[PDB]
Amino acid sequence: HWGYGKHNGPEHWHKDFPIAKGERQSPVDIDTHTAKYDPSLKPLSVSYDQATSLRILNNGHTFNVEFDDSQDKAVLKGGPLDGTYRLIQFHFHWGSHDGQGSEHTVDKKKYAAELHLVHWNTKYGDFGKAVQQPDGLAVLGIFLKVGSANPGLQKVVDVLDSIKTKGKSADFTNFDPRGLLPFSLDYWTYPGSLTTPPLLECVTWIVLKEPISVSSEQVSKFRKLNFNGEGEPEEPMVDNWRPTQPLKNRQIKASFK
Ligand SMILES: [Zn+2]
User: Fold this and answer.
1) C-alpha span between 40 and 170 (Å, rounded)
2) Which of 91, 104, 132, 152 is most buried (CB neighbours < 10 A)?
3) What secondary structure, in 3-state letters, does 100-131 show?
4) How far apart are CA 11 and CA 223, in angstroms?
5) 235 exposure class (CB count in 10 Å sphere: 0-12, 13-18, 19+)
6) Which residues constitute the catalytic centre?
7) 3-state helix, strand, coil in the chain (%, to 5)
8) Which residue numbers belong to the known binding site?
9) Strands (DSSP E) along 9-168, which ranges?
10) Which sequence spans correspond to the domains of the chain?
11) CA 14 to centroid of ligand 1, rounded, Å
């Protein structure tokens, strides 16, 4: 019912999801000169040592790596957050070519891809309750810059040929998401939304300044996925990104001076 095509794409999402034109929509452009250091931010704590990946799936929009979120096995704390946020899945957005694909931009520059690690606030008990609250979700956003091959991505790349069409999934256990993090956790933060329908304004965005690498060959494997289901005309899964939205009455804060 929604997608990234001419008919069903970001320019038309507002018809069925009028919040698409709301106060706190994502992604946004990050102006690095006007994002101000915020000394009230606490240190950011990523605790992924016990993370338990389960499956990888093509949902017709991207591919998701799903985690066991029945316990505090992989959590995000600190920074702008109050309380504990549990990892439920991560996924990517990417382009048709290396010069586009990210959702957030930095001084109007696009990266080749962007990684989203989605976490929900445990005080709401269940992801489905959390997404209804303004402090329900915390999404780590990590930019991918084409350069050297990334070993922490390779297990993902290697399984993508098994989930080429919408609705396919594969077993995906023992994947360590720490291998997808940059070495510095310096970040920008702002209040926003899911970047796909239903576009709910429940997200504390934490966008890391340091990108991770991806080889040309690795991102080319992302582009061999398809939006369509089996037996339908082929629609390559590329350019599954929403363009940036107006900042409106928000500020982007920096964790670093
Ligand atoms: Zn995303």
Assistant:
1) 43
2) 104
3) CCCCCEECCECCCEEEEEEEEEHHHCCHHHHC
4) 22
5) middle
6) 61
7) 15, 30, 55
8) 91, 93, 116, 195-196
9) 29-30, 36-37, 44-47, 53-58, 63-67, 75-78, 85-94, 105-106, 113-121, 137-146
10) 1-257
11) 18
Helices (H) and strands (E) in the chain, counts: 4, 15
Structure obtained using:
X-ray
For residue 246 the two structure tokens come to 């107006």
Nearest of 145, 149, 144, 123 to residue 134 by alpha carbon: 123
The tokens describing 215, both together, are: 């080889």
Distance 92 CA to ligand 1 centre (A): 6
Query: Which candidate, 104, 139, 98, places its Cα nearest to that of 238?
Result: 98
Q: At how many Å resolution was this determined?
A: 1.5
Dist. CA 140–CA 179, nearest whole Å: 14
Find tokens 């398809």 and name the residue: 226
